Amino acid sequence: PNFSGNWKIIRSENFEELLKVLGVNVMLRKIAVAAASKPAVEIKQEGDTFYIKTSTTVRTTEINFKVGEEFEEQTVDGRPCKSLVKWESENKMVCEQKLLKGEGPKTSWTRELTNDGELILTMTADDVVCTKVFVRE
Ligand SMILES: CC1=C(/C=C/C(C)=C/C=C/C(C)=C/C(=O)O)C(C)(C)CCC1
Ligand code: NA
């Protein structure tokens, strides 16, 4: 697969409910949901090595990882975690996360290139799943 690109959002579902499970309060959720509505997503892939930059007016994150090698990032609500990405299948990666400190919902994310050329991101906290779909700009 070729995840490389500058990706533009075309669908977002359940992001506020995700932040709810994670315990983000109402006014912060408003800030987050408004900013997350128009993110910029840059992905560079070389083999199983990835760079992913996700930018919004209120928070930007940059991660560098190799599939199968543990790395550190943050949960969507900003808590440090250890992450491990694996290929669930040829076109879908899945990331399991573990908090560095403390307790909280079990979090994960997935990114999949679909047969139509689009990119599906999911982010999960416990049972609640947020789905975002992108196409290259
Ligand atoms: C939750 C949250 C905040 C905003 C987080 C944002 C904006 C997350 C964006 C995630 C995206 C954009 C994920 C993706 O699509 O990969 C702010 C800064 C208000 C602080 C309170 C907690
Ligand atoms: Na492969």
Curated annotation (Swiss-Prot):
GO cellular component: cytoplasm; cytosol; endoplasmic reticulum; extracellular exosome; nucleoplasm; nucleus
Binding-site positions, all-trans-retinoate: K132, V133, F134
Intracellular or extracellular location(s): Cytoplasm; Endoplasmic reticulum; Nucleus
GO molecular function terms listed in the Swiss-Prot or TrEMBL record: cyclin binding; fatty acid binding; retinal binding; retinoic acid binding; retinoid binding; retinol binding
Inducers of expression: By retinoic acid.
Keywords tagged on the record: Cytoplasm, Endoplasmic reticulum, Isopeptide bond, Nucleus, Retinol-binding, Transport, Ubl conjugation, Vitamin A
Gene3D superfamilies in the cross-refs: 2.40.128.20
Domain notes: Forms a beta-barrel structure that accommodates hydrophobic ligands in its interior.
Protein name in the entry: Cellular retinoic acid-binding protein 2
Species in which this protein is naturally found: Homo sapiens
Upper taxonomic lineage: Eukaryota, Metazoa, Chordata, Craniata, Vertebrata
Gene name in the database record: CRABP2
